[PDB]
Protein backbone atom coordinates (compact mmCIF):
# COMPACT_ATOMS: atom_id res chain seq x y z
CA UNK A 1 0.00 0.00 0.00
CA UNK A 2 1.66 3.77 -0.33
CA UNK A 3 1.12 6.69 1.66
CA UNK A 4 -1.50 8.38 -0.65
CA UNK A 5 -4.18 5.08 -0.51
CA UNK A 6 -3.87 5.06 3.01
CA UNK A 7 -4.33 8.86 3.44
CA UNK A 8 -7.27 8.58 0.82
CA UNK A 9 -8.41 5.84 2.63
CA UNK A 10 -8.94 7.51 5.89
CA UNK A 11 -10.31 11.02 4.99
CA UNK A 12 -12.99 8.83 2.86
CA UNK A 13 -13.65 7.15 6.17
CA UNK A 14 -13.50 10.18 8.53
CA UNK A 15 -15.42 12.15 5.90
CA UNK A 16 -18.29 10.22 4.81
CA UNK A 17 -17.36 10.04 0.71
CA UNK A 18 -16.58 7.60 -1.56
CA UNK A 19 -13.10 6.68 -2.62
CA UNK A 20 -13.38 8.23 -6.42
CA UNK A 21 -14.33 11.66 -4.97
CA UNK A 22 -11.08 11.95 -2.77
CA UNK A 23 -8.90 13.18 -5.62
CA UNK A 24 -5.24 14.52 -4.58
CA UNK A 25 -6.79 18.23 -6.21
CA UNK A 26 -9.87 17.98 -3.72
CA UNK A 27 -10.06 20.70 -1.01
CA UNK A 28 -11.52 19.31 2.33
CA UNK A 29 -14.43 21.95 2.93
CA UNK A 30 -15.01 22.83 -0.34
CA UNK A 31 -15.36 19.82 -2.47
CA UNK A 32 -15.38 17.04 0.09
CA UNK A 33 -17.99 18.73 2.36
CA UNK A 34 -16.02 18.78 5.54
CA UNK A 35 -17.39 20.93 8.66
CA UNK A 36 -15.89 21.89 11.89
CA UNK A 37 -16.07 19.03 13.85
CA UNK A 38 -14.41 16.91 10.81
CA UNK A 39 -11.58 19.39 10.74
CA UNK A 40 -10.58 17.89 14.36
CA UNK A 41 -11.25 14.55 13.82
CA UNK A 42 -10.03 13.87 10.44
CA UNK A 43 -6.49 15.58 11.96
CA UNK A 44 -6.35 13.10 15.10
CA UNK A 45 -6.76 10.51 12.79
CA UNK A 46 -3.92 11.40 11.21
CA UNK A 47 -1.70 12.02 13.35
CA UNK A 48 -2.75 8.41 15.25
CA UNK A 49 -2.09 6.44 12.00
CA UNK A 50 1.27 8.28 11.02
CA UNK A 51 2.29 9.25 14.80
CA UNK A 52 2.90 12.92 14.20
CA UNK A 53 1.89 15.75 16.16
CA UNK A 54 1.20 19.07 13.52
CA UNK A 55 0.27 22.34 15.12
CA UNK A 56 -3.27 22.73 15.03
CA UNK A 57 -2.22 26.58 13.13
CA UNK A 58 -0.55 24.72 10.72
CA UNK A 59 -2.85 22.17 10.38
CA UNK A 60 -5.55 25.04 9.61
CA UNK A 61 -3.90 25.90 5.92
CA UNK A 62 -4.14 22.29 5.00
CA UNK A 63 -6.42 22.22 2.91
CA UNK A 64 -6.09 19.69 0.38
CA UNK A 65 -5.73 16.23 -0.09
CA UNK A 66 -2.68 16.28 -1.18
CA UNK A 67 -1.35 19.10 1.01
CA UNK A 68 -2.03 16.59 3.59
CA UNK A 69 0.05 13.26 1.91
CA UNK A 70 2.76 15.68 1.45
CA UNK A 71 3.18 16.76 5.33
CA UNK A 72 3.09 13.20 6.47
CA UNK A 73 5.51 12.27 3.74
CA UNK A 74 7.75 15.33 4.84
CA UNK A 75 7.16 14.71 8.87
CA UNK A 76 6.43 11.20 9.17
CA UNK A 77 9.33 9.14 11.03
P1 LIG B 1 -15.71 25.65 12.30
O1 LIG B 1 -16.54 26.85 11.87
O2 LIG B 1 -15.17 25.86 13.72
O3 LIG B 1 -14.49 25.52 11.36
C1 LIG B 1 -14.62 25.41 9.96
C2 LIG B 1 -13.22 25.50 9.33
C3 LIG B 1 -13.38 25.71 7.81
C4 LIG B 1 -12.51 26.73 9.95
C5 LIG B 1 -12.39 24.22 9.60
O4 LIG B 1 -13.09 23.11 9.03
C6 LIG B 1 -11.03 24.40 8.90
O5 LIG B 1 -10.21 25.21 9.32
N1 LIG B 1 -10.78 23.64 7.84
C7 LIG B 1 -9.54 23.71 7.07
C8 LIG B 1 -9.20 22.45 6.27
C9 LIG B 1 -8.97 21.22 7.11
O6 LIG B 1 -9.91 20.50 7.47
N2 LIG B 1 -7.69 21.00 7.41
C10 LIG B 1 -7.15 19.90 8.19
C11 LIG B 1 -6.75 18.81 7.20
S1 LIG B 1 -5.97 17.28 7.77
C12 LIG B 1 -4.41 17.75 8.45
O7 LIG B 1 -4.07 18.93 8.47
C13 LIG B 1 -3.52 16.63 9.00
C14 LIG B 1 -2.19 16.53 8.30
C15 LIG B 1 -1.38 15.34 8.82
C16 LIG B 1 -1.10 15.37 10.27
C17 LIG B 1 -0.26 14.14 10.66
ZN1 LIG C 1 3.09 -0.72 0.06
ZN1 LIG D 1 -19.87 12.35 -2.15
ZN1 LIG E 1 -11.18 22.55 -5.25
ZN1 LIG F 1 -20.42 17.36 11.51
ZN1 LIG G 1 -2.23 14.52 19.68
ZN1 LIG H 1 -4.34 19.42 17.13
ZN1 LIG I 1 6.85 5.62 12.53
Known sequence: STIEERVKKIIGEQLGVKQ???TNNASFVEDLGADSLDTVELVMA?????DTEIPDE???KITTVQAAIDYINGHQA
Open 20 to 22: EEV
Open 46 to 50: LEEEF
Open 58 to 60: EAE
